[PDB]
Homo-oligomer: A and B are copies of this chain.
């Protein structure tokens, strides 16, 4: 049928079997690049706005304020326009692409200082909302339960259905933790199957690995955009994570290049990280006959001025 606005069209993304990764086709990928704003975030942009409306936090008149490095800003920005909200986004004043894309979607952009970076813009966002709390709503991707909820309701059931319940393993890079949390809850709790949930983080910032091992948390710089926030976010449910896999920046990129040239899949850099990690678990006899489903958060063109090209 016909979606009332772009927000209602989120998801129903396809499963594609890999040919040059895994073992006799045991690695299938979910292309989240096929969304209204072309990322997994389209799901949480739609559901964080919907839920804020259902509980009167977001009202006709009120104005979205938020800080974004990328995908969620673009997602929350297509939703704002579709549903008729003014939005203000703050960002480490960067990617000229993402700046031009955001102004294109009718976002009132506020640039912070580089040296301060991501936490620079968060502060600035908060100030704008403390200037007039009654007119501003910060949705807060890293802790908003509406983030994991849409993945329990949509991304997870789609995996169940499309695999006919044969899914044995889910692999998901962790940014907010929303996807692995929501997906894992759907299959383990709603559908009653005891899959292996695998979180993927950069080896350069292995904070989930470090936490779970009782070792000093040392975050670090990497090139895998969308994962490796350098802290454990509230929307990563550790309790549902059966395994953590680390990937280096170089491998992730090469794997993203391999996905394009060898499989004809236009995947983002974080997509190369999940697939590198899935490929390793797939070439262990213990996962040989298991069906491994991998989340490919974004598409290639979002990355044209990055190390991916």
Contacts and interface: CB of A to CB of B under 8 A. Distances in A.
A265 B36 contact: yes
A240 interface: no
Contact of A264 (B33, B34, B78, B163): B78
A12 B96 CA distance: 32
Contacts of A37: 264, 266
Contacts of A122: none
Given A82-B263, A301-B302, A309 B100 contact: yes
Contacts of A104: 257, 260-261, 300, 308-309
Nearest to A37: B266
Interface in A279-309: 299-302, 304, 308-309
Contacts of A189: none
B262 A81 contact: yes
Contacts of A263: 5-6, 81-82
B3 A14 contact: yes
Interface stretch (A15-23, A62-70, A169-177, A206-214): A15-23
Contacts of A31: 9, 36
A16 B1 contact: no
B100 A304 contact: yes
A3 B192 CA distance: 25
Contacts of A1: 15, 162, 164
A140 B19 CA distance: 28
A264 B14 contact: no
Contacts of A299: 38
Contact of A260 (B5, B83, B106): B106
A301 B303 CA distance: 10
A2 interface: yes
A67 B309 CA distance: 22
A265 B6 contact: yes
B266 A78 contact: yes
A33 B182 CA distance: 27
A115 interface: no
A91 interface: no
B301 A101 contact: yes
Interface of A: 1-7, 9, 12, 14-17, 19, 28, 31, 33-38, 77-84, 97, 100-101, 104-106, 162-164, 257, 260-266, 299-302, 304, 308-309
29 contacts: A1-B15, A1-B162, A2-B17, A2-B162, A3-B16, A4-B17, A5-B16, A5-B263, A6-B264, A6-B265, A7-B264, A9-B16, A12-B12, A19-B84, A31-B36, A34-B34, A38-B266, A38-B301, A77-B264, A79-B264, A81-B261, A82-B264, A100-B309, A101-B304, A104-B257, A104-B260, A104-B300, A106-B260, A301-B301
